[PDB]
């Protein structure tokens, strides 16, 4: 099983994948995020945040109101399953989480919580 994925967030406010499949055989899953853009994190910062599809809107809404210093995430938000830090041009960050934090039959979404970015920077994640 392929238990990791490399993802990029760029200056065009786009991730380079719209869907991630996590194989059930995997015990852990790793996301390696990078920023090939030129813009700094205060204007084009990107993070990779995971939640159920149902909780996405709440996480995004409260994240925006949280500010840059809080990585645009509501402190201790229980709806966030896993997340990388917010990164800007030339930076990279990885996050590894336990696959047992996911279940079959539930739709998950990964997205960036920087203000306005989730309109384009989002995708599905599914355990199969």
User: Among 14-22, 33-41, 58-66, 111-119, which window interacts with Cu ion (CB under 5 A)?
Assistant: 111-119
Contact 109, 122 (CB under 8 A): yes
Q: Indicate whether 83 belongs to the interface with Cu ion (CB under 5 A).
A: no
Contact mark string toward Cu ion, 23..52, x via CB under 5 A:
-----------------------x------
Scanning the structure block, which residue is given the tokens 């238990």? 3
C-alpha 24 chain-centroid distance: 20
User: Residue 72: which H helix or E strand, with range?
Assistant: none
Among 33, 49, 112, 127, which residue sits at the site for Cu ion (rule: CB under 5 A)? 112
To Cu ion, the closest distance from the beta carbon of 121 in angstroms equals 5
Report the distance separating Cα 1 and Cα 43, nearest Å: 37
Scanning the structure block, which residue is given the tokens 């993802």? 7
54-73 binders of Cu ion (CB under 5 A): none
To Cu ion, the closest distance from the beta carbon of 25 in angstroms equals 31
Sign of the CA dihedral with 67 first, then 117, 61, and 29 last: negative
Scanning the structure block, which residue is given the tokens 């090939």? 36
Query: Which residue positions form the known binding site for Cu cation?
Result: 46, 112, 117, 121
Query: Which residue positions form the known binding site?
Result: 46, 112, 117, 121
For binding to Cu ion (CB under 5 A), which residues are involved?
46, 112, 114, 117
């Amino acid at each position: 099983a392929e238990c990791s994925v490399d993802i990029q967030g760029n200056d065009q406010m786009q991730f380079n994948t719209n869907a991630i499949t996590v194989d059930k055989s995997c015990k852990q899953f790793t996301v390696n995020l990078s920023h090939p853009g030129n813009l700094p994190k205060n204007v084009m910062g990107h993070n990779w945040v995971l939640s159920t599809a149902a909780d996405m809107q709440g996480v995004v809404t409260d994240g925006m109101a949280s500010g840059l210093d809080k990585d645009y995430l509501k402190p201790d938000d229980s709806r966030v399953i896993a997340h990388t830090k917010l990164i800007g041009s030339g930076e990279k960050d990885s996050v590894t989480f336990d696959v047992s934090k996911l279940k079959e039959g539930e739709q998950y979404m990964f997205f960036c919580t920087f203000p306005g970015h989730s309109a384009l920077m989002k995708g599905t994640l599914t355990l199969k």
